[PDB]
Amino acid sequence: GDQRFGDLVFRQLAPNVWQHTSYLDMPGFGAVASNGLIVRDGGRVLVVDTAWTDDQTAQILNWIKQEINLPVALAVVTHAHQDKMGGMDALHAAGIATYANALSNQLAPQEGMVAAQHSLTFAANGWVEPATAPNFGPLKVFYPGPGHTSDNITVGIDGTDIAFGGCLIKDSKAKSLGNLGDADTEHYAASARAFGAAFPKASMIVMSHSAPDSRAAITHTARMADKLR
Ligand SMILES: O=C(O)[C@H]1CCCN1C(=O)C(CS)CS
Ligand SMILES: [Zn+2]
Ligand SMILES: [Zn+2]
User: Is there an atom of ligand 1 within 6 Å of 70 CB?
Assistant: First the structure.
């Protein structure tokens, strides 16, 4: 279930995988949830996405210390928006190595974010260049093309049924495709489909602004994105 830890929520998704959830008032929209992931890889922990704020992100690290009690080797953030990179300083204060798409690091200052320390680059087929993602263990990082943003990246967790679409994917029951302020409306549908094709066996799709869902999240998101063109 949903473990409440201060103002955050944690949910175990698999033996070594948890979802972190944090909330921010978006004046005119209410308190918006954002999800990321925590993965135990043997004797270390890997984080996908910060919380919205430094204070919330320090609480993620607090929860990890209580519930896992192993060092956080690295974090990867999935685009330069506040829900994914707003807590970078908390990671850096904690001594955690940080990674983002090169383009996310380029965009970070203008988006009001602190850049990650390290930049990922991607091959033509979308897979991360392995030299740029050293020691990523089971995290398989894929750039699906521009969609939710120009820099959005996605992450599969090897050894599990899980793939993380970040803010690119909404759930199968979503009424509409939101969070589109920086979206690439022409390429969105293809990028959503490319995410699905990159992780063809993943049966649990995790995303920033919906609870985990089946692969119908991907098909439904892509279908709605077809209407943006
Ligand atoms: O408000 C929007 O449309 C876009 C563009 C600016 C940030 N954004 C978001 O939705 C937030 C979550 S509220 C980050 S994914
Ligand atoms: Zn975003
Ligand atoms: Zn988001």
Answer: no
Kindly give the number of the ligand 1 atom that is closest to the alpha carbon of 24: 13
Q: Give every CB contact of residue 20 below 8 A, 6+ residues apart in sequence.
A: 8, 9, 10, 35, 36, 37, 38, 47, 49, 51, 60, 63
| Cα–ligand 3 centroid distance for 185 (angstroms) | 16
Query: Can you list the domains of the chain with their CATH numbers?
Result: 2-228 (3.60.15.10)
Which single residue is written with the structure tokens 């899980």?
162
Residue 48: strand pairing partners:
37, 76
**CA 202/CA 79 separation, integer angstroms:** 22
- Contacts (Cβ under 8 Å, ≥6 apart) of 80: 100, 103, 104, 105, 107, 108, 111, 113, 149, 151
Asked if residue 33 has its Cβ within 6 Å of ligand 1, the reply is: no
Which atom belonging to ligand 1 lies closest to the Cα atom of 82?
14
Kindly list the distances between the CA atom of residue 170 and the CA atoms of 22, 71, 148, in Å, as whole numbers in the listed order: 17, 31, 11
Using CB atoms within 10 A of its CB, is residue 87 exposed (0-12), middle (13-18) or buried (19+)? Answer: buried
